[PDB]
Amino acid sequence: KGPWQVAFIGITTGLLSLATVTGNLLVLISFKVNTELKTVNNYFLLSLACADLIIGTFSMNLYTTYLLMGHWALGTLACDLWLALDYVASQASVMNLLLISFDRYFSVTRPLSYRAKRTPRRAALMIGLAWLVSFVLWAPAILFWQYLVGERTVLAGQCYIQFLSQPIITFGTAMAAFYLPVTVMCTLYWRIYRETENRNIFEMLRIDEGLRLKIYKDTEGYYTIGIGHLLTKSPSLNAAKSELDKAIGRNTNGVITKDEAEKLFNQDVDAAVRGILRNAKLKPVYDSLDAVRRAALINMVFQMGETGVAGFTNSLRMLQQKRWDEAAVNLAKSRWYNQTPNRAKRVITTFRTGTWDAYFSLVKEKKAARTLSAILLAFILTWTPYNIMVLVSTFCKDCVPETLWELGYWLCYVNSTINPMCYALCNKAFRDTFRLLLLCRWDK
Amino acid sequence: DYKDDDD
Ligand SMILES: CC(C)CCC[C@@H](C)[C@H]1CC[C@H]2[C@@H]3CC=C4C[C@@H](OC(=O)CCC(=O)O)CC[C@]4(C)[C@H]3CC[C@]12C
Ligand SMILES: C[N+]1(C)[C@@H]2C[C@@H](OC(=O)C(O)(c3cccs3)c3cccs3)C[C@H]1[C@@H]1O[C@@H]12
């Protein structure tokens, strides 16, 4: 390695090092000192920032130094500790990506039952166990394989992992550790892309119809449970409970769980849409509408039934003609509007605007999606060349050159610099605490 | 889980 080369690489990866340390350390201190940031969401980013911090302060610098000098000078035990720390931290980063992806998936697909158990305790337990499984997966074999085999194979002055002898070995580990997590993450991500609409429908109908896990008597008097699930119009409090037990599958005794309310809601809403597509009057307009207004009409069918909604003849035609304001005014003439005005006005605003403004704002959530997509894409592109190089090195011996190995190994470190720069700068509270910390002027 | 956060 030439002197100019050494100076350039050392300076640049130095800068990248202190940028990683500064960023992730700022996440840690901001979380510690600002209670507004002490959210379960930020538990995960704190753990990620611990991994990226470890990588930023030890890994990039020891690896860049050993690569520039050409030999390892800190000894065998320091070598083993460095590789153990690097692989444990990196596998931890992957594991936290998986944990975030699953957390988001369950938050969208089980918006009621999962959100009820997203407690700081459970978050801390699963973060800690992600780190535990990373450590168990990498540290024992990196440090003690030499004593178990009986001799240390790695040359004096050099530093690498002994048990990754064969390229097929390291490619199997690359599948378990990288490829399968990446595929699971992507399949999730897409699944959330295809489920946000159903969650918005669920939350809309929970706002309008309410949620009770104990049976109550509705407007007309009949017995209902869950999110507006009517059991039976009979007057017998146990004629209701028998149909409840038949609907869930256990002796309900009148009380259900929130995931049973989610199951009951899914059966109800699927029945609503399936019926809509069976009804000759509602199918044309439902087909003509976008997703949000489709949700408004699903709302009306949930409240009044298909015959009752089909009774809105002229307003439904105005909906088919995209005459939103005239349809709003016309639906305001209805007894429906005069009997449940607060819900009817929300539904009407949904028809008029085609947005969720009458029910909820999704700005912060959409930006959180942008942040997560940025993080995972940075991960994929900075980590993919190395694992592709493993994949190739299994089929062919020594195709990929040593320079390429060095660069692809070094590139996996960069997403540790990128991760805090995603949520931190464009997310408020983080930005403001970063500012007041870098100013040394934080007094609560 | 953001969704409910204020702007
Ligand atoms: C292999 C070795 C060298 C690395 C293992 C380090 C772990 C022991 C660390 C890394 C990330 C840490 C976690 C990152 C974030 C949190 C959230 C944190 O929640 C709060 O602080 C909010 C409540 C409060 O402020 O009191 C509690 C600790 C915990 C679980 C940490 C516990 C310790 C963990 C698992
Ligand atoms: C630059 N690294 C520090 C080292 C090489 C790269 O590693 C990879 O991407 C691999 O798929 C593997 C390399 C060799 C076998 S499996 C992972 C290892 C641990 C989790 S995923 C990325 C990170 C990780 O700490 C290793």
Q: How far is A147 from chain B (nearest CA, A)?
A: 46
- Pick among A200, A365, A423, A427 to test the B interface (most B CBs inside 10 A): A365
Query: Residue A192 — φ and ψ, nearest 5°?
Result: -65, -40
Structure tokens at A406: 């060095």
Residue in A104, A107, A361 closest to B7 by CB: A361
d(CA A29, CA A285): 54
Whole-angstrom CA distances from A415 to A138, A264, A297, A422, A425 are 21, 43, 45, 10, 15
Closest CA to A422 of A40, A124, A9, A52: A52
For an interface test with A, give the residue of B1, B4, B6, B7 to mutate (most A CBs within 10 A).
B1
SS3 of chain A: helix, strand, coil, percent, to 5: 75, 5, 20
C-alpha–C-alpha distance, residues A348 and A332, integer Å: 8
DSSP A172-233: HHHIIIIIHHHHHHHHHHHHHHTTHHHHHHHHHHHHHH--EEEEEE-SSS-EEEETTEEEES
Do the Cβ atoms of A36 and A94 come closer than 8 Å?
no
Residues A197-210, buried b or exposed e (16+ Cβ, 10 A)?
Answer: ebbbbbbbbbbbbe
Length of chain A (residues): 444
A223 bridge partner residues = A217, A232
| 3-class SS shares of chain B: helix, strand, coil, % to 5 | 0, 0, 100
Q: Whose CA is closest to A393, among A92, A385, A106, A28?
A: A385
Q: What is the resolution of this structure in A?
A: 2.7
Give dist(CA A65, CA A6) in Å, integer. Answer: 9
Chain A residues close to B1, C-beta within 8 Å: 40-41, 103-104, 107, 115, 118
Evaluate whether A334 touches A345 at the Cβ level (below 8 Å): no
Amino acid identity of residue A296, one-letter, is: A
Method: X-ray
A398: left (phi over 0), alpha (psi -120 to 50) or beta: left
CATH class (in words) of the domain with range A3-192+362-438: mainly alpha
Output phi, psi for A157, to 5 deg: 80, -15
Specify the ligand 1 atom closest to the Cα of A38. 22
A269's tokens = 């809403």
In CATH, which of 1.10.530.40, 2.40.50.70, 2.60.40.420, 1.10.260.40 is domain A197-353? Answer: 1.10.530.40
Spans of all domains in chain A: 3-192+362-438, 197-353
Token pair 């607060």 in the structure block, residue? A342
* CA neighbor of A48 nearest in space, from A323, A367, A424, A387: A424
The answer to whether A20 and A55 are in contact (CB under 8 A) is yes
Residues 6 or more apart whose Cβ sits within 8 Å of residue A160: A83, A154
Question: Do A3-192+362-438 and A197-353 fold alike per CATH?
Answer: no
16-55 of A, contacting B, C-beta below 8 A: 40-41
Q: How far is the CA of A282 from the centre of ligand 2 (A)?
A: 55
Residue with tokens 């929130």: A258
